[model samples]
Target chain A: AILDLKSLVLNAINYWGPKNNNGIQGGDFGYPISEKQIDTSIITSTHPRLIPHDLTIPQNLETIFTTTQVLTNNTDLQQSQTVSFAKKTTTTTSTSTTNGWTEGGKISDTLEEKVSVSIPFIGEGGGKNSTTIEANFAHNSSTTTFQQASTDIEWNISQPVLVPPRKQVVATLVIMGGNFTIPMDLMTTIDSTEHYSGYPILTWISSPDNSYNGPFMSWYFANWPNLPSGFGPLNSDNTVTYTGSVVSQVSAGVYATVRFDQYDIHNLRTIEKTWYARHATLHNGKKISINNVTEMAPTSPIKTN
Target chain B: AILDLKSLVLNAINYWGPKNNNGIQGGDFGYPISEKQIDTSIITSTHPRLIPHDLTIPQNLETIFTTTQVLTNNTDLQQSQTVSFAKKTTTTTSTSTTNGWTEGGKISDTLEEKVSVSIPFIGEGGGKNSTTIEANFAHNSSTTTFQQASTDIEWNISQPVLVPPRKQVVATLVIMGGNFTIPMDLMTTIDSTEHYSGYPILTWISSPDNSYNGPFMSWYFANWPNLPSGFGPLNSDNTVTYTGSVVSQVSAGVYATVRFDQYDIHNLRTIEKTWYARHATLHNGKKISINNVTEMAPTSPIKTN
Candidate 1:
């Protein structure tokens, strides 16, 4: 039942018309844009008997994280040289219900970032001239912008529906204009361990006891080979290859997820990349599990402002 | 790309076939189910020159809460009196990004519960044998199980899309077979305030600067009447009644939402009902805001096990 603003269509990027406003045929490639909308606010169908519930989002989800890092080249170089380096590593642990929606509707995501700078030295018996090589090493990282859409309506399904959600990366993120300058020599050695949880989604069904929500259905993660963008390993389409858990329609009082592998190519350039999904439980739904990134060596790219 | 197990269809609830196993016929509520799926993994559209992102979900979201309370009657009556009382409460605060998705992808919704019992006392000084009187004041609340589906894929949208998410209560919760015993005398004063944030959804666009994630757009809570489950006020369709903020498509930078609201009809019978959505920002996205329940009297119902 949520509403939408009027349909908006505007040529994105530069050349709204043209750099010089060319009178005729002056558009930037005339990029074809398809303006389609998902009435996330509306539910076409509901459960015949059981009441359906949306992945109701809480009234809160705002957090800020500015991470920094420091390093030292505990080595003695013959000469003062420039080194390229990058550093960003942080951990954020919080209680969650599912991927974006929380059963309790409380947002507990917080940022715990480290701020510092790393430098190199010529070692113990170095002369003043070889003490340090700086200048080009100071490259600031531009901000990483992450935005999300379609999440609201998914969490607000008004009727009993069978749409089941599984975990995946939700923050559609992009890194641009970032200068994580690592001197040429350090290019092969600088790397940070990246660990971000996947986005969470599950299907819950109603019970004879009026299952408040329903059983949160779960399936194991199925890793696929990397394709371009839409049709890749991370796509939610390749169900055959998925590995992990399956839920019973009968009764499994406690719900759990079997652990799986990580996304192959992508790396967390920023120290604070976040992940949301459900974890396996032992005592209460208190235990948490996460996969560590594979490559922790020399990954930060060297970009200039 | 992530894959799907497959399109599954089985008569939901009972009636997998006929209740009496009728070879020819007999079905209970042949609920017409429209099984449609959203390519949540494939980004149908992406920013032309910029990168698109998904509403990343985290890898954690499981919690348990069981609340209990006790009340005593300090009244002195010449005759023994019977009473029925119902009690359950708790609070949960968390850090979140958008609904069904989190910036850090960390699920921080947890459960906090109290266990204790209170009884009635017979005035300061009375008959030696009238020190206390107690009976028929216990009702065990069935599990308020809540399940959510479709949230996983929502957080995994592949590319830069024009979709935006606003905050709303994400948990599709229901109360069934709950018996909160309260002496009829206490029914009139057994109310609890109901507080649930609207699901969080915001539209974020990419920037020329390669904005990793665009700004998170937000709007105020719109209070509408309690229409049938779908078409009524909480449906998000009544955007005109929505009260709050808006975002600029420019470099206004930091995203924020103006806070207001409480879902009118629903009462948090369980002490630990939860809420999710972003909070207003004074400096960092650290500050939190939540509406207090309107009524704290006679809320829990008198259901028997």
Candidate 2:
């Protein structure tokens, strides 16, 4: 999966240690150091599971030799059982009826032939079946330092080896600064009214069928009262209160959110939910876990049954 | 916080659960089944700080109040003492003029006519200092759903809330359909390249800001892989493989995957890494958390840095 570098930049803000660092003395970025490392640990405990069908797994059809070759070379080895024997019960009187009995028992003498054959290995060649395709994912965080007050930053990484099956792509994202993950889900929804016009607008996420990524088990925006910096509502006295929590679980499908308030105490704070995803995993019996957040707004009943 | 209800409605296929019952047992259509809730046990050991924040608690301004009013409205009588010179004359005679007695003080009194008082009290018919603004919340899911085939249902939820000032929103998602959480980020990344657009996207997460009456951390996209009445996936022999396990978990963030050579006969596989938030409890009785998912890709040097 590839992502825009810009979103990653936002994540750095929060992950980066604060000036007051979390009570750890003489930590990596010693009190008020010139440089710091963004806490990538926040992105820990991620249990990604890439669906088998969702991935491009190769198959070996070469072992399935062609029936055409078998028929031509192994023709004589086709049958074994011969016709039933005649009533030779009265063998004692056999000599009498002599060969007549033999003819009656087996008027048709069996003609048998055996054949041996070997098939040359046939490769499936380079077709959808033979193509050894795997995705090459190259990602990097910007080394360039952001100037003070550079709230918005751009981040980019090399493209994955494979482009999702012709736009059938969904991008999961998580831009966690203080406690907020930005741009929850990538694709825009289909507008029914637009049905008369065309398929719903395809802005970011493409291809509805082929590629899919995240929306991990339990993503939350529960850090409401103490939302990450630069996002929250400020009271009349210029104080922002972290006041909300949420818990959610999603499946292979795309998961997105729409924020409804602003965190800037002096302004109207609102926003939608962001998107997230999980890729493949190494373990077989691995498990994805979800936790309980204070707030868990049930999706609109309209979207539910 | 207004939603494109039209789009939501269009995405709704007929509900499959019971007509008007909880999803715990079965559907109202007489389908008795067991309730499959998300496993929260793992949450304890993993991300213990993943606590709940109740949005149902009204956002009240008074909770942050810390000021007191004071006024000087009344005055009281006081007493004063005066020293006479007759008794001190005898003592001062023995004392030399250079001693402390040498300092003679003369008091002069002047009559002043002044009477001022301030009467402070409640203003005439004080009605309302301010109105208790009821929090009006606007909420939405990030993804949309549609029936691609009878059983091949597609669903996506994104980071719905867009933080103001910051046009882009983000989140880390973990979807769980069966045994995996499709690498949605990969799909989304491909989609971005396909479209070549730069619109920021988000994952399905809660709003960090305290503006809306949300923080509802409920699950979305529960109706996964809902095939039509009787169809399922087809195997190589054209039969259905309905016995496979379900997928789960997907992290949301920028990522890079490569088309690495296949490892044995296992299948299409890619080695990828992720960058995301880090959360921890500190010795100073504080939680240390960060959001750093977006910037660092799996192959990015930033991941290690």
Candidate 3:
């Protein structure tokens, strides 16, 4: 009986509810859940309820019930519910190195975190349940100082995107701080299918939420939906494919879709030849997304007018 | 007898011409042997003309007669012309490496020259006469380009000096190109006796006589004489001493007292550091020579400024 109840809740959240349009799906939680909104009356049956003297619940669920519990007269149901439960838990740990840019120099920071969770109903059928959360962060930096007076600098950010057939994703990239002039350096590389419509837009304001100060370099993916294919697989052959059709899904597929890589503007200059980039913040609201853009350098042959 | 005539010409040029006003010296010859203005009559014989058909004179002495014959019947002096002669010849080959600078990079040019000449009376002693004048030049250049967009460069020159006890040398350095604005980056280091006076002088002109071209970033070193103890002996144990007096010498001790080295200005900038330098090109004509000057980089703190 305990296993049955655990199965009920698990199925309700992942598949049953989504199929019946009763639960949220496919979007970031945005923030952690602050309240538990499960209804206990659904488990009630007609009769005087018989309670077990030593019944154990998962720690998290125990806290939910400790705050408030709805009791019902379900003597016959409780008596027949003598099932024991067993639960299995799994944990995943990942570490990644991300490159970063700062006013003084370049930096590389390490990110590590462990996540552990279990199937909802597994703990109710004589199964065990456990949860683990670990987060770790470490960073190292090295930068070369500018040696002369009145010198200029350049900052570059790599934005990568991945897309599967028939589905789409939108990304809004925002660069903040640096007190620098904007319309980000134009894309050194652009896909043929990509179109630039409108100019860049600029607004003078305070930092967002004061979390990080910035007049903010913001751009929206207004026309990303119009592109048939999205930009990028940072590496040449890293594309992903989805074999299932949208109609047969229990959920609309969702992916993070975009990543940003940064560098100082000065690093882009060279003595052998000259190259140019558009001002940041002036890109207006125009946006485009195309598949597999090729690299473009100043040495690239000029196109005929 | 040949040594006697050679000594006559030597004394006439060195101590006699400029000193007693008798021989030619001090100025560049521009060309060699185009004319021989010797007054042959300086050699006289007190006798009647008794010209000998087979002159029996030294092989080269015959040319003097062919050009102009001062036939004299001085049988005693003519018989003494049978003086035997022995001549010596010398050949010198020298090569040197010269440090040079250009907007693109650094260069090392090979300097090769051979010098062969006979003593004034050697060819007159029936010896073979041959003069070889060959000056060959070759240069190599290599430069590294800056990778970033906004980089500055620094060009540093070596400063060298030699001093005798109780004496001083005045040197004026002049830079004449690269239309760069005046007010050079400040010297990061300075000497106790150093003085900074007026701003650097600038002149807009074409490259100087095809030797080098520039809009011109020029600077002159003035007041170098004002320093009681001059700027440097870059190394702690480096020192030069001359044991002789200046007046007794045929040649004053001269040396290349300074060298110039440059770099991208970005290498000169500072966010928290303060520096200073003299204005470019305001030296007022004074110059000095020093023995083989050595180069120093901006990063070397000991000899800076």
Candidate 4:
């Protein structure tokens, strides 16, 4: 028996697309109403199983094919399969009489035609198949920088992978100097009900979604015994007990933190500070540059510039 | 000489508070015009140093006293010192000079007064001093809960430690049914520049400042080849390829994610699913329930009852 190609494709369509039969509708195959499989097998007995179907590939098909053609194209539909076809060949036979018993048995000749074909199924391995497609949807852009303050600097990095699922991994880093001395008056302005100053605090983390970024994880140092409670006064040791939020991990779908510790002491003195991404590793352990800081200076010594 | 305690207290007052010295005007302390040190040294010359001064202590004074008084209250004026005073005594002397040889040395007697005492000074240990004040300014509150979806829920735990400055730590979670069928229409409605639907995606993370929350981090699945962009057609294999973002970490000041893969493919059958916070660790490695999931069925096959 010959392989029924049209039948097989129909079977796939039935399983994937809207199942109009058996009250099973709404199939996964989202084909256009006019785009239907053309069954030409009925017209030709020799190729009774042949059928042609119109495939509405994405506009990105050109790129997909171009790239795949250049490389080893292993699309979802390119899985190995075994197929067999049998054909009848020329036949010869000798006549025999039953009643009269054509005593001498006549020799018979038989003819046979056979062929073996292998076809690839475009299916399964969906997970890996789309990897190449993702490669083509690559986008790399220059980092956009913004100067938020004299010591506060911000920049955004865009790395978009728009393949099958359109994965986006963009990030932003805000670097501001910490451990700086400002006028007592400036300290009052720094810890206002809304705004704050000091240290390169992470104000916002840009999400891949792009609609909006994360919250300002940056916490302002509260002079203990003053507004912005929880922080204690500067200890006789010159360090104030700090208890507030601090960014521990800031990256693409990840932003996590725990309560900050004793190290977050708030003091009105000029001290050498190092700011950098801490424990900030990408999902795949890829290193990111958002969580890093170098020496940051204050506007003035016991005064705001 | 006696300690002159009144003079010493007056000296501290002159240094710390506004001083009215001979024609000189600036003051280091911020004190009221009417509050003045009492001069109580007129009655006793023996304890001429004794003095009393008014001290403005922070509101946490009671607890500070309860603790320090129970221990050793080495207050500001407390200090180690040695006091000295002259004392009267009997004495004899012989006269020399005068009238030549004339015999006789006359004996004479003299008297004197002397005394010594020790006192304490109030200075140093500013750090350890402020710690006592903090001990009195502690507070605890109840957690707040918010109903998010049909079965999904969220709440915030508050542990505030406020003084003249107010501090708050409140967290929220978005719990939605996982592995349940949601209406495909809802999925389409999602990812429209702002909102999205599917899994119980955390739309927002409360800011520590409480001014505003973070953006919607909801992830939308791209059905292979259709619906979501870039995804290719579903494979002939029974599994439909899906790709989207999955949060890697969600906590205060931190949220991260990476591309998600397979296992997103299961037939569109209504299945009961429960979602809970995953990898939700507070900043200091404290267990938290911020990133969690609960039953959030799709709007379709698993019509929410």
Report the C-alpha lDDT of model 1 over A6-88, residue by residue, as the tens digit: 11111211122233211112122232322221111111111111111212121111112222222222233222222221222
Highest DockQ scorer: 4
- lDDT tens digits, residues A42-117, model 2? 2211111111122222222222111110001123232221111111000000000100111011221211111111
Q: Could you say which candidate leads in TM-score?
A: 2
- Candidate 1, B184-238: lDDT as tens digits: 1000010112111222222222222432211111111111112111111212111
After superposition, candidate 3 runs with Cα above 4 Å error: A1-180, A185-230, A237-305, B1-305
Q: Write the per-residue lDDT of candidate 3 for residues A1-305, one digit (tens) a residue.
A: 00122122223233322232221212222222111222211221111111111111222111010111111222222211111112121212221112111211223132211211111111111222111112121111111221111211222223323222222222222222111110100011111111111111111111112222111000111111121121111111111111110000000000011222222223323222221111111011112111101121001111111
> How displaced is residue B177 in candidate 1, in Å?
50
Ranking by DockQ: 4, 2, 1, 3
- Cα deviation at B159, candidate 1, in Å, is 49
DockQ scores for all the models shown? 0.01, 0.02, 0.00, 0.03
Error of 1 at B123 (Å): 68
Interface RMSD of each: 40.2, 30.4, 44.6, 36.3
lDDT of 3 at B140: 17
Q: Write the per-residue lDDT of candidate 3 for residues B1-305, one digit (tens) a residue.
A: 00122122222222322331221212222221111322111221111111111111111212110111111122222221111112121212221112111211222132221211111111211221111111111111111111111111122233333222222222233232111111111001111111111111111112113232111011111111121121111111111110110000000011112222221223323222211121111011122111001111111001111
Model 2 stretches with alpha carbons more than 4 Å out: A1-20, A23-48, A53-305, B1-305
Q: Flag regions of model 1 displaced more than 4 Å.
A: A1-110, A115-203, A207-214, A217-305, B1-305
Give the worst 10-residue stretch by lDDT in candidate 3 chain B: B242-251
| All candidates: TM-score | 0.11, 0.15, 0.10, 0.13
The alpha-carbon deviation from the true structure for residue A187 of candidate 3, after best TM-score superposition, in angstroms, is 9.4
User: Which of the two, 2 or 4, has more lDDT?
Assistant: 4
